Amino acid sequence: LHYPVTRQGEQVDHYFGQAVADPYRWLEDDRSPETEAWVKAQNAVTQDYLAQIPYRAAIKEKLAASWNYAKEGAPFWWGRYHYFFKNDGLQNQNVLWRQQEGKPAEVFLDPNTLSPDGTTALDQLSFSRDGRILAYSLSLAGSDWREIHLMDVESKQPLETPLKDVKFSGISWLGNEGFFYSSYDKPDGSELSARTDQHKVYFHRLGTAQEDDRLVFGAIPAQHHRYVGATVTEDQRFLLISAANSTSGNRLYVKDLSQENAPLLTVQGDLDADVSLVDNKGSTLYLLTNRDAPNRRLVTVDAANPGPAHWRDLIPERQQVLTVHSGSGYLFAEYMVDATARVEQFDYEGKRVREVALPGLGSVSGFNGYWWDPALYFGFENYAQPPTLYRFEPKSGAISLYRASAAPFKPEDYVSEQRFYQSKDGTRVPLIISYRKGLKLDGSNPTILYGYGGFDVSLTPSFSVSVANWLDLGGVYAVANLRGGGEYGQAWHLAGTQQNKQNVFDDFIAAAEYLKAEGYTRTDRLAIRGGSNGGLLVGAVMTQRPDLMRVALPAVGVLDMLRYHTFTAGTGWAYDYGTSADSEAMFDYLKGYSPLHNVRPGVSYPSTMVTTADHDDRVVPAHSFKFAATLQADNAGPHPQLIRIETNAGHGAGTPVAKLIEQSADIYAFTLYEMGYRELPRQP
Ligand SMILES: O=C[C@@H]1CCCN1C(=O)[C@@H]1CCCN1C(=O)OCc1ccccc1
Ligand SMILES: OC[C@H]1O[C@@](CO)(O[C@H]2O[C@H](CO)[C@@H](O)[C@H](O)[C@H]2O)[C@@H](O)[C@@H]1O
Structure with missing residues (x-):
């Protein structure tokens, strides 16, 4: 696997006098020919990698056929x-x-x-x-x-x-x-x-x-x-x-x-x-x-x-x-x-x-x-x-x-069960686990653990044609109602903000441990996914516990926690995150988990597919660009660190069905392939 060459610049930022190097700062210039060329090169590498997966076309056709109603x-x-x-x-x-x-x-x-x-x-x-x-x-x-x-x-x-x-x-x-x-x-x-x-x-x-x-x-x-x-x-x-x-x-x-x-x-x-x-x-x-x-x-x-x-x-x-x-x-x-x-x-x-x-x-x-x-x-x-x-x-x-x-989906074919697992500090956190009936708890089921955890957002049950297809392919889908969310009100939300943000990551790691302990899945059959604040969630967990999962899927994530407030309306998230300009304590805490600043050379990261879009002005794609560049430069293991940049699309709202189908097909194909499947687990 040959990643495009990503040059390292000389930019150095200072926070209360402490120097922090930012070698990929140039990728923040979304209008430079250099950044545009890097995006094309990365997409080419990603598409070439995905093209080697034998069942990617089958997954896309399965999705399109079931979506067609x-x-x-x-x-x-x-x-x-x-x-x-x-x-x-x-x-x-x-x-x-x-x-x-x-x-x-x-x-x-x-x-x-x-x-x-x-x-x-x-x-x-x-x-x-x-x-x-x-x-x-x-x-x-x-x-x-x-x-x-x-x-x-x-x-x-x-x-x-x-x-x-x-x-x-x-x-x-x-x-x-x-x-x-x-x-x-x-x-x-x-x-x-x-x-x-x-x-x-x-x-x-x-x-x-x-x-x-x-x-x-x-x-x-x-x-x-x-x-x-x-x-x-x-x-x-x-x-x-x-x-x-x-x-x-x-x-x-x-x-x-x-x-x-x-x-x-x-x-x-x-x-x-x-x-x-x-x-x-x-x-x-x-x-x-x-x-x-x-x-x-x-x-x-x-x-x-x-x-x-x-x-x-x-x-x-x-x-x-x-x-x-x-x-x-x-x-x-x-x-x-x-x-x-x-x-x-x-x-x-x-x-x-x-x-x-x-x-x-x-x-x-x-x-x-x-x-x-x-x-x-x-x-x-x-x-x-x-x-x-x-x-x-x-x-x-x-x-x-x-x-x-x-819809061509029969509710009676599935199980959707709610459990409350224990987080590091003892807090019981809700988890809704869905799958096709007939599942065995032998620890072998390919599983996607999803979370968000912040901004008083509550993850309530929702139907997704893409998720239903994952279940039909034999997968398990688990959604954690992590702190930071609004499921249990303001106290639940505040327990996941500013210098308590680590509670959110601990809650997610515990969900992963529960799924393995109960037999739904195992390390090499587990993928974690999240978008925006959930993208940060995946970025933080994969840099803190790269041994926890087989696949990491951070979508349109906030990954540079030291500079996120300098773009578009990002400062509007300071209530939840705090900013590096608030104090030395807040700066240290942010630097302590910021995904971009916690990727380390010599570490073997799980297979990763960072996803973003060129018109995402909610969370600028530079977050994803710099993170992917850092993973490609630092990863010492044999697993691919890819980035998929959607063109003519944004944060997510209003994305046309055609693009949604291609994205899900790529994600599921990549996930099963990285878990070592040579053929689909179930007939598409
Ligand atoms: O393509 C299917 C993927 C793999 C498994 C869950 N997926 C999803 O797309 C799920 C279900 C719908 C929201 N979602 C998701 O990841 O949202 C990320 C996101 C959250 C908030 C703002 C922008 C993007
Ligand atoms: O896990 C072995 C299985 O993987 C496949 C499909 O991805 O090929 C992979 O493993 C080969 C070595 O066994 C590599 O040479 C190849 O590049 C890699 O994709 C199957 O061919 C093989 O049975």
Whole structure:
């Protein structure tokens, strides 16, 4: 195996006076011909390696055939039409259809006709109140940047010129006059890696040029924030503006639109808690918050004097984490019970109406709608159960099947069991293990252990065609609900942040030890996988315990923990990670686990396939480039250290089906091949 030559530069950084060498610093320049040439060379080596795997084509065909079935989402009613997304089976992007009573359904907006390779994706959709205009945002090549387009709803004709430089933005209409959106000024330098830290809310009035858009929030010094959002309430009475510097905690302001020149009132003026508006009933605001509530609570307050001192509990905090949805005049409290959903229906006075029975143990979607929706829809799924849609009539509580899955997977063929293993410090951590029935605990099953562990993100059961295929190939898929996550509230999250981050890695190592001890797998039949913060997870575990697994799959990972805060909106992760600029203690702790700085020459690393994408502006690909370069230079063992750079794709959202299939095929082929399989374990 011949890796491309990666030169080592002379760059040396200093942290509180301590020197740290960065030989691959030049790979951070995403626009240099040198970096572009290195990417092509690496991809060529990776493709040549994968080309030697005899069953890679079979895996890809197996995946494509099983993915090829009709899919349809819940209907959305607006104006004279009902809108719904559909995919005939293998369309790169889902298609937006619509239908009005008395007439046949028709294609309304087909993203597949917007690019030659299915890489342009539809993100936000927001109709004007009269239903005559639609504003929608599009992502190009998968980056976080967006363009907002406008179209006449009835004729489908494009209107005006698209708005540019939109990012991390919703689209909220003020009647039919125009809409609010968020944007960062175009950075000087590469828009894919340059730092952006001053998010602004603008208002676009129909019939004008974007340059004339009114600046609403975020320009004056006192309002500078890395993340800002503005939403007009359903009744058009209030404008809510949220503002934050990190992914946890936010300020919230409310402006009475009924009053002329109404001042911005402070709902929450500090960043010590997360607070969001669920809905409003007149001047009464319903807020979901973790302020003085680790597992969250729902409170109410009058918009005229909305401060925290006046918040009153409506749904008090419980032992389980709360999320609140609203629709049809009811509040739906979704609780997490060991990472699985339970739903309770409440009226706006906080009185419990009933518990909503769910089809089983898994995740739910939906239960969200307007006060005027006669019925609500919700979806249910888990690792062995493809998404199923149900219609729910809130008043009677009647539940009916709206759409059964057309997937070629039979839930009854699989086992999905939950266990709680002990981490190093004694903490019991949840683990959901899925596989085809008939499995023997003889320690030989090829297994993929997946985790994330951070940012209050909870890994609840979800159906994946790719995962189901791994199970059909005879594999075991195990998902750990590591600390750092939000499964058990804020305490669970904080136990995996800053100088406690090692707890997350310890939790993951313990999951791997449990799977081996119980006989599901063994060292040479184990692979670990994770993306973004989960990519860091894999990078840290493989550098700390390179003997623990056979295969490491870090996807779009944060791997240079000393410089991650210097790119795009990376500083927004400082609440979870801390930064090398915080103090000598934080710098030492970060350097102590930073994957890039813990690869050592002479060590034999497991087979690794680092994956990233050229338009990933969430986590710049340079993290992956420098890490892969270091592994190729330092690895002393016989196992391959490869990097696969997806072209015309980003962090992940909106990736076309065609690319998703190729990626999964490459990952599974590589994993089985590195585990020594000469043929597939089961008939494809
Ligand atoms: O191609 C299948 C791979 C091998 C086994 C699990 N896989 C996955 O892709 C799983 C299931 C869906 C999310 N996922 C994943 O790895 O996500 C990584 C990620 C997480 C967060 C942001 C970007 C990317
Ligand atoms: O594990 C042996 C098995 O591996 C295969 C398929 O990958 O070839 C590998 O091992 C060979 C040495 O036995 C190497 O020469 C070859 O490059 C490597 O891919 C099978 O051919 C062999 O039976």
